[PDB]
Design a protein around this ligand. Structure first.
Ligand SMILES: CC(=O)N1CCC(n2cc(-c3cnc(N)c4oc(-c5cccc6nnsc56)cc34)cn2)CC1
Length: 295
């Protein structure tokens, strides 16, 4: 629980790259280092911004964004620069989009659950992220390593129904989100894109039972996990610790996650029947590797 202190005058700020729950994130330089910083856009944000430092001073984990230091001259946080930027951008952003594999898809989710599991295990009190979604998931090391940010804080497509119903919630809201992200990286589709209108239309939908469509040829181990994560009832969702364990196990069947994203991709988006959709990733190699171990 300590924060390295930075003089703001020794930072050279550059173009905007993000905006989280509050503040604004920019590309910047600091001691000849490529860097991200978030600032307060308004003096009114001073208080929330201080709480986030008190949490981030305590966290420390490979799948959470490295906070280099901070400053109070004007109040600001200095982080590592995710060259890849947002997972949202990688999946859905401007062209050219990178090619990625099932192995990448699962490795990303594994890494996210590892990050959240750490948060959930925090003492004296668990940190709940509350806003898990690809815009908050940053990539480094050539698309290989995923890192969480904007935690302890257009979100409706990843929000557990008990949250937006204003009711009591817990760690399990993050598990719902994670279930949605899993679907998203396997399909490379925006959840509830075809619903649209404002967020309340998605909230009504999800509240009333609606989930993303099922995925043609999805392995059942993964399908059962994903859909347990989506349960209306939070107590029916697995814990993140369990998701980590499961996902660690499945990675046996997904080699190649260490390969950097380097191939462009011009995939079209072929709409399924309306009931089921096709995955973007290919599970053929999973089914083959699985056969060698089992039947
Ligand atoms: C491919 C492309 O168009 N690029 C390269 C990637 C660039 N990029 C870097 C970030 C980025 C880098 N380092 C960070 N630490 C970052 O954090 C965020 C970010 C985004 C949203 C909320 C949030 N909260 N805390 S950090 C945060 C973005 C970002 C976002 N885009 C944009 C231009």
């Amino acid at each position: 629980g300590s924060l390295h202190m930075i003089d703001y005058k020794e930072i050279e700020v550059e173009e905007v790259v993000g905006r989280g729950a509050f503040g604004v994130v920019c590309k910047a330089k600091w001691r000849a280092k490529d860097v991200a910083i978030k600032q307060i856009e308004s003096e009114s944000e001073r208080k929330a911004f201080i709480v986030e430092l008190r949490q981030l001073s305590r966290v420390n984990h490979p799948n959470i964004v490295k906070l280099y230091g901070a400053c109070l001259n004007p109040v600001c946080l200095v982080m590592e620069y995710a060259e890849g930027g947002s997972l949202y951008n990688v999946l859905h952003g401007a062209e050219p989009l990178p090619y990625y594999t099932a192995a990448h898809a699962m490795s990303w989710c594994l890494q996210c659950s590892q990050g959240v599991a750490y948060l959930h295990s925090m003492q004296p009190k668990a940190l709940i992220h509350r806003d898990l979604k690809p815009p908050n998931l940053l990539l480094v090391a050539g698309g290989t390593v995923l890192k969480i940010c904007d935690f302890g804080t257009g979100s409706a497509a990843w929000m557990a129904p008990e949250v937006f119903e204003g009711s009591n919630y817990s760690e399990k809201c993050d598990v719902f989100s994670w279930g949605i992200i899993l679907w998203e990286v396997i399909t490379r589709r925006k959840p509830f894109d075809e619903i649209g209108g404002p967020a309340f239309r998605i909230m009504w939908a999800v509240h009333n039972g609606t989930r993303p469509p099922l995925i043609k040829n999805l392995p059942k181990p993964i399908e059962s996990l994903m859909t347990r994560c989506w349960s209306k009832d939070p107590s029916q969702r697995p814990s993140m610790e369990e998701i980590v364990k499961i996902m660690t196990h499945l990675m046996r069947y997904f080699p190649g996650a260490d390969e950097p994203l380097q191939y462009p991709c011009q995939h079209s988006l072929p709409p399924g029947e309306d009931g089921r959709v096709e995955p973007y990733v290919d599970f053929a190699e999973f089914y083959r590797l699985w056969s060698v171990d089992h039947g």
